[PDB]
Amino acid sequence: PPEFGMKEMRESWKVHVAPEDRPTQQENDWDLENLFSVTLRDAGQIALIDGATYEIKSVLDTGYAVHISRLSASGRYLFVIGRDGKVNMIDLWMKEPTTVAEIKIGSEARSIETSKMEGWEDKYAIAGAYWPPQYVIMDGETLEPKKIQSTRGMTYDEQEYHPEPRVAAILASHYRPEFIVNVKETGKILLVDYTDLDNLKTTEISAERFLHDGGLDGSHRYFITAANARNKLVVIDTKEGKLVAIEDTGGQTPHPGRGANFVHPTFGPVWATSHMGDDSVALIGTDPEGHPDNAWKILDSFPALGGGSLFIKTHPNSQYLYVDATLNPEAEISGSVAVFDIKAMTGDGSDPEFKTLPIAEWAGITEGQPRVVQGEFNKDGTEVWFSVWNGKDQESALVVVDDKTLELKHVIKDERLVTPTGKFNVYNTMTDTY
Amino acid sequence: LAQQDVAAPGAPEGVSALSDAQYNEANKIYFERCAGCHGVLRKGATGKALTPDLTRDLGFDYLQSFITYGSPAGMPNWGTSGELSAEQVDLMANYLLLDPAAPPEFGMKEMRESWKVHVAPEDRPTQQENDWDLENLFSVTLRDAGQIALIDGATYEIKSVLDTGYAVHISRLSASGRYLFVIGRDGKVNMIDLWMKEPTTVAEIKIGSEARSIETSKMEGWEDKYAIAGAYWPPQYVIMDGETLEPKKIQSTRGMTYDEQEYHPEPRVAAILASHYRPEFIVNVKETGKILLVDYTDLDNLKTTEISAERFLHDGGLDGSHRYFITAANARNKLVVIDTKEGKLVAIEDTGGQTPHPGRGANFVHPTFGPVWATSHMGDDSVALIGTDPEGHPDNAWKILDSFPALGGGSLFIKTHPNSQYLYVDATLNPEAEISGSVAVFDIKAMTGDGSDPEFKTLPIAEWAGITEGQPRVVQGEFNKDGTEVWFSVWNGKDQESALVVVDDKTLELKHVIKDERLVTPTGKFNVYNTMTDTY
Numbered sequence: 001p002p003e004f005g006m007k008e009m010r011e012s013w014k015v016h017v018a019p020e021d022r023p024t025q026q027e028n029d030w031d032l033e034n035l036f037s038v039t040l041r042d043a044g045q046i047a048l049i050d051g052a053t054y055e056i057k058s059v060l061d062t063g064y065a066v067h068i069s070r071l072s073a074s075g076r077y078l079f080v081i082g083r084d085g086k087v088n089m090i091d092l093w094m095k096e097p098t099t100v101a102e103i104k105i106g107s108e109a110r111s112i113e114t115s116k117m118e119g120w121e122d123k124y125a126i127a128g129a130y131w132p133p134q135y136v137i138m139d140g141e142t143l144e145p146k147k148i149q150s151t152r153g154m155t156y157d158e159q160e161y162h163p164e165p166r167v168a169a170i171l172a173s174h175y176r177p178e179f180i181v182n183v184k185e186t187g188k189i190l191l192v193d194y195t196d197l198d199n200l201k202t203t204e205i206s207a208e209r210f211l212h213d214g215g216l217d218g219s220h221r222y223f224i225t226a227a228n229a230r231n232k233l234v235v236i237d238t239k240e241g242k243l244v245a246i247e248d249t250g251g252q253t254p255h256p257g258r259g260a261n262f263v264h265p266t267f268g269p270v271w272a273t274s275h276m277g278d279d280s281v282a283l284i285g286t287d288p289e290g291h292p293d294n295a296w297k298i299l300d301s302f303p304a305l306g307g308g309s310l311f312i313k314t315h316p317n318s319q320y321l322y323v324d325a326t327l328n329p330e331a332e333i334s335g336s337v338a339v340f341d342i343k344a345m346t347g348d349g350s351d352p353e354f355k356t357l358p359i360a361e362w363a364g365i366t367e368g369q370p371r372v373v374q375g376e377f378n379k380d381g382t383e384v385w386f387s388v389w390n391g392k393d394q395e396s397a398l399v400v401v402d403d404k405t406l407e408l409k410h411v412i413k414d415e416r417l418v419t420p421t422g423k424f425n426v427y428n429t430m431t432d433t434y
Numbered sequence: 435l436a437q438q439d440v441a442a443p444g445a446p447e448g449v450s451a452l453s454d455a456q457y458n459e460a461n462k463i464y465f466e467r468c469a470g471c472h473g474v475l476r477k478g479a480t481g482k483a484l485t486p487d488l489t490r491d492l493g494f495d496y497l498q499s500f501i502t503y504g505s506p507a508g509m510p511n512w513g514t515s516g517e518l519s520a521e522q523v524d525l526m527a528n529y530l531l532l533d534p535a536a537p538p539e540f541g542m543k544e545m546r547e548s549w550k551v552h553v554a555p556e557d558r559p560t561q562q563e564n565d566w567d568l569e570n571l572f573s574v575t576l577r578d579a580g581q582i583a584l585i586d587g588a589t590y591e592i593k594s595v596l597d598t599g600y601a602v603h604i605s606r607l608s609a610s611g612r613y614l615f616v617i618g619r620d621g622k623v624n625m626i627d628l629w630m631k632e633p634t635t636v637a638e639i640k641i642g643s644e645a646r647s648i649e650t651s652k653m654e655g656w657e658d659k660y661a662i663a664g665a666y667w668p669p670q671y672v673i674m675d676g677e678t679l680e681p682k683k684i685q686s687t688r689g690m691t692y693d694e695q696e697y698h699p700e701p702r703v704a705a706i707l708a709s710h711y712r713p714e715f716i717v718n719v720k721e722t723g724k725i726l727l728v729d730y731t732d733l734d735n736l737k738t739t740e741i742s743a744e745r746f747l748h749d750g751g752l753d754g755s756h757r758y759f760i761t762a763a764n765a766r767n768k769l770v771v772i773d774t775k776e777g778k779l780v781a782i783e784d785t786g787g788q789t790p791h792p793g794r795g796a797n798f799v800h801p802t803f804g805p806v807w808a809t810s811h812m813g814d815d816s817v818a819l820i821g822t823d824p825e826g827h828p829d830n831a832w833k834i835l836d837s838f839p840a841l842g843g844g845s846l847f848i849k850t851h852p853n854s855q856y857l858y859v860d861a862t863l864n865p866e867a868e869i870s871g872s873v874a875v876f877d878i879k880a881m882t883g884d885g886s887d888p889e890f891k892t893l894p895i896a897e898w899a900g901i902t903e904g905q906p907r908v909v910q911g912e913f914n915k916d917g918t919e920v921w922f923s924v925w926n927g928k929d930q931e932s933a934l935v936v937v938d939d940k941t942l943e944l945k946h947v948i949k950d951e952r953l954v955t956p957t958g959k960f961n962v963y964n965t966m967t968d969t970y
């Protein structure tokens with residue numbers, strides 16, 4: 001299998017608009033923090049959609065099948081990475097936002113993130129690849145590749161050499177000027193300090209194998225991530241740079257996305273995950289100072305719509321916990337979302353009731369069996385969007401739900417809305433509000 | 435790797451096959467004679483890459499000719515020297531066209547299988563039980579015999595000859611001076627308890643297929659806690675329990691080159707030192723040009739600093755203050771300086787010489803320049819001095835202050851001691867026997883740093899030993915604990931007579947010659963006190 005190093009990255013690196021030629025203030029009249037960046041998967045595009053008016057402001061060409069959008073800490077720069085390893089950086093301040101720089105970082109990739117420590121706004125971006133097993137730290141204004149690190153190495157437990165440790169989720173610390181890198185097959189979480197790329201400080205945390213996705217707790221101090229194939233949640237303290245806990249969720253194949261933080265009426269601050277392998281939702285306590293007896297313990301587990309869930313969501317202004325069932329084989333389940341009333345949760349051991357929102361039905365799609373995927377809130381936390389993902393030559397939609405009432409707010413359809421998948425609100429992504 | 439039996443791969447289009455016997459004969463030759471320059475994976479090191487994609491384009495005739503006649507640039511003439519028969523030359527040319535099967539990894543399971551604790555810590559002495567002066571003992575490698583000799587520093591008596599791994603490369607001592615660690619070139623580590631009535635190996639372990647370095651934890655408070663070993667093959671280092679040798683943490687060194695940032699599949703671990711400022715090991719990774727500062731305070735949440743340095747890192751030493759690590763990036767003629775307190779690169783300087791080879795080097799206070807560290811060179815006769823005092827001699831710090839000739843090229847080791855006024859330089863690999871069997875000695879007190887070249891006295895070490903027979907090569911000065919006597923090895927072949935020569939440092943005259951039928955191929959010598967304390 002071919003390697004992909006600095007020479008290869010630099011050959012693919014193009015700066016379309018140099019920093020000095022970009023605006024010094026916002027030159028369009030858009031409401032950038034309420035904008036949604038929506039993947040148009042099979043079109044190799046993204047749509048920038050007004051969070052209040054639902055107007056598609058622009059459709060931009062990107063790498064094929066963008067996996068996620070991430071925002072710089074200032075909210076000015078939009079970063080997307082295709083599954084092919086192509087990264088595009090877009091300047092939202094331009095009169096007509098477009099790609100200002102691009103680069104290829106490997107042959108297979110899923111993650112990108114921006115520096116989020118106070119004082120390091122817009123300084124760096126980082127991308128992780130499945131192939132070659134590596135991550136790369138890039139300049140936050142130009143995408144210049146600055147530091148490439150191989151993730152080949154020893155497994156944490158058996159301590160045997162692994163020739164293919166894929167980089168899974170990448171998050172950014174709010175406590176130290178560090179990136180948080182999950183290395184799947186070796187079961188290591190890397191805390192990479194970007195204050196000095198020549199004298200590179202890292203903390204390689206032995207965790208659990210099969211690390212995938214995860215998120216920070218409400219305080220933004222603790223990183224909670226799924227070692228999915230081992231059904232565990234690994235907790236690392238980003239302030240102290242150390243593993244704090246590893247706990248089994250009781251479910252099969254936890255798949256949080258970035259997860260859902262909320263204040264449980266009985267348990268206090270918790271983070272929740274749903275599962276791909278069963279219908280369960282698990283809650284872990286996230287407050288060692290205030291609720292020490294509940295911290296890092298699995299406090300409750302209860303059913304949602306069905307197996308094949310990918311994303312769980314809430315917002316500080318919402319009383320609701322939304323859970324999709326995207327990969328369920330049954331169209332009636334994959335086309336709907338479960339919604340729990342957080343205010344009604346007692347943690348008495350019973351199974352909280354949920355309301356079933358018929359999201360695909362609300363979108364009115366005649367053909368196929370579209371899959372509903374990934375709740376994402378607007379900046380005010382008053383509306384939540386879901387993608388109604390159908391095939392490239394079929395009819396898809398976005399469905400906007402009024403969070404206060406749980407009623408349909410708006411259906412977004414456009415001929416350009418091809419295979420809509422991930423949706424990222426600028427404000428909630430730049431601030432890690434989830 | 436050479437003694438490992440492998441399967442003969444089939445031959446693809448346009449290539450001819452080798453029988454099982456032919457392929458195993460070629461494979462043994464490759465690892466015994468070629469991999470040291472061309473790499474275990476055939477990706478190239480001193481010698482060019484020899485992977486099938488490249489060799490199949492060169493063709494059989496080209497390969498056969500190069501192996502037969504060699505070249506002036508460093509590739510031996512295997513065929514015309516008679517080292518390889520005509521049939522073996524062809525076997526190698528054919529072998530290089532065939533796909534190399536993956537060399538064996540050597541992880542935790544394999545290390546633990548090889549790990550033996552002969553005397554549990556609980557069953558060992560609680561105080562020194564022999565009457566030896568351990569701090570003045572010397573641990574001497576008997577290379578080709580796979581042994582070491584423990585020799586009394588004052589009486590010159592061989593106290594014991596212990597069996598170890600083959601061709602021990604160096605001896606290192608725990609910070610307390612109790613435990614003696616040795617590592618053979620095949621990756622075998624032996625730990626010896628010097629407090630026993632009859633010191634012997636108390637624990638042993640294998641850490642790889644090919645290795646050169648071992649070191650002990652030297653941060654105050656961490657005495658005897660850990661040992662670390664580095665391998666050439668697999669490209670990895672391993673931190674082990676300082677009392678039992680239990681393997682605790684194995685780290686691969688495969689990774690990206692610091693400058694071109696390209697993946698390198700075989701970055702060999704070279705020198706390993708121990709910080710006196712932090713609870714860290716200092717690990718040189720040759721091919722990627724990275725110096726790793728590895729914090730052993732927490733092996734689960736492992737903190738490291740990966741310092742971009744210069745490719746071809748090999749050996750080096752700490753300055754007199756034990757704060758700065760000065761190491762040779764030998765093929766690029768540079769010295770790299772790292773601050774172990776702050777954990778950062780502070781300088782990279784060309785020595786003006788070809789292939790600096792300091793060993794741990796030589797620290798002294800130059801009468802006019804201030805604190806300096808010295809290195810000699812394999813590729814020329816020069817001795818270079820670098821300033822090591824950023825606070826007290828600021829303009830001189832990390833600058834090459836002087837460069838002057840010694841006996842000739844082929845130097846490996848330079849040496850001094852705080853109680854000596856002399857700087858000793860060998861010339862082990864010089865082609866001239868008169869030079870290779872002698873050492874140059876400079877008088878530090880007479881150095882003026884006026885730009886002229888300091889004179890040196892030539893000590894005829896091999897002649898003093900009474901050895902001319904065969905090919906005696908003098909190597910590596912090592913002082914006793916008091917810094918009053920300096921020893922040199924007279925390294926002859928295994929079927930020839932060798933010796934150790936003890937020089938009186940005050941008079942620069944012969945003191946004593948150590949000879950013994952057991953003293954086979956004596957190479958490295960390490961005094962317990964000077965090694966435990968990094969006094970050089």
Ligand code: DHE
Binds near residue numbers: 167171212257421
């Ligand atoms: C490593 C990884 C992350 C974390 C990214 C980060 O931290 O920036 C992630 C996040 C994501 C997120 C992040 C949501 C969030 O709110 O953070 C989304 C929307 C997403 C949509 C999909 N992912 Fe994802 N995803 C993979 C990997 C990943 N997905 C796969 O290896 C996998 C299993 C298979 C694959 O074919 O790629 C897979 C399938 C999917 C989907 O089928 C989705 C729905 C669409 C698609 O194009 O493949 N993945």
Ligand code: DHE
Binds near residue numbers: 601602
């Ligand atoms: C990586 C390395 C170190 C640092 C050790 C540490 O930090 O603990 C070192 C040190 C050393 C030291 C350390 C002396 C000191 O005072 O620190 C000695 C005596 C030594 C005797 C030899 N070395 Fe050495 N040496 C190699 C590697 C190394 N040698 C080789 O790859 C090389 C070039 C070729 C080889 O075949 O091994 C090589 C040839 C030699 C010799 O020919 C010597 C004289 C004998 C021998 O067995 O090969 N090496």
Ligand code: HEC
Binds near residue numbers: 481483500
């Ligand atoms: C270090 C001293 C070496 C040893 C031992 C061996 N080789 Fe070598 N080889 C070395 C160098 C520095 C070079 C570069 C070419 C030059 O001009 O010196 C080479 C080259 C070869 C080649 C040619 C490759 C090419 O030209 O692309 C071959 C086929 C080769 N070497 C084979 C080879 C074999 C089979 C060896 C074991 C018997 C061997 N080399 C030992 C350095 C060194």
